[PDB]
Structure 1
């Protein structure tokens, strides 16, 4: 059965870019998906996306604009001490000057760069680059 929704989603996105596709249909929608795409689109990795109101759970149509190599989930959502944030970004990102490990803190879902500044930490949701 469905066990992540957010992993199901980022997958379809990856398989879309890979196969040269320019759009995706993401079912179902969810808050965690939404704020994730925000962190993605705000950094220029996707285009516009658009929720669809079925009286159920949602759908999204995202616009891929190339330049996306891999957006991924990390499962389970591991607990990350603030000093271990580094050892993740070291592990699952290409170089020290781009790409993002987007987390989830009690100060809201955000990328590791930002959360570094706000001096917050928490659980790790996934990665983008």
Structure 2
């Protein structure tokens, strides 16, 4: 039924970007989703956001810039050992000028660019550009 709620969040983000609306409602909340949007915010692709704290499970409302072509989730959360990123680079990123990958390292939810410097690797959550 309800599984991998990161996908449920990011397909709503995708439909709202393709439609052209301003702000999205997402009924589940995860620390995964919050740190994912933190990476997207720090790299500037979204705007400011706000978490309605339900006692049960909150709801995230995100102001949208309008730059987001495509965000999404790789489904089974594959492992990625280092010196195996370049497969995912050529397979997922639209170019060698932009695009980002969200790894899950032991030292936090990191970025494709911070991961190669921190020299960790780990599991893939998703991608956005």
Any conservation in 2 of the 1:30–1:58 contact (CA below 8 Å)?
Answer: no
Separation in structure 2 between the aligned mates of residue 24 and residue 105 of structure 1, nearest angstrom: 28
Say which SS state the counterpart of residue 18 (structure 1) adopts: helix
Q: Which residue is equivalent to 1:28?
A: 28
Q: Which residue is equivalent to 2:71?
A: 71
- Alignment map for 1:54-65 (pairs within 5 Å): 54-65=54-65
Per-residue deviation, residues 19-71 of structure 1 (Å, max 9, x unmatched)? 01111001111110000001111111110111111111110001111010011
Say which SS state the counterpart of residue 107 (structure 2) adopts: coil
Q: Which residue is equivalent to 1:122?
A: 122
The number of residue pairs the alignment matches comes to: 129
Root-mean-square deviation (CA, aligned residues, Å) is 0.7
Asked if 1:108 corresponds to 2:108, the answer is: yes
In structure 1, stretches of 5+ residues that fail to align are none
Q: Which residue is equivalent to 1:53?
A: 53
- Alignment map for 1:3-22 (pairs within 5 Å): 3-22=3-22
TM value normalised by structure 1: 0.97
- Alignment map for 1:80-91 (pairs within 5 Å): 80-91=80-91
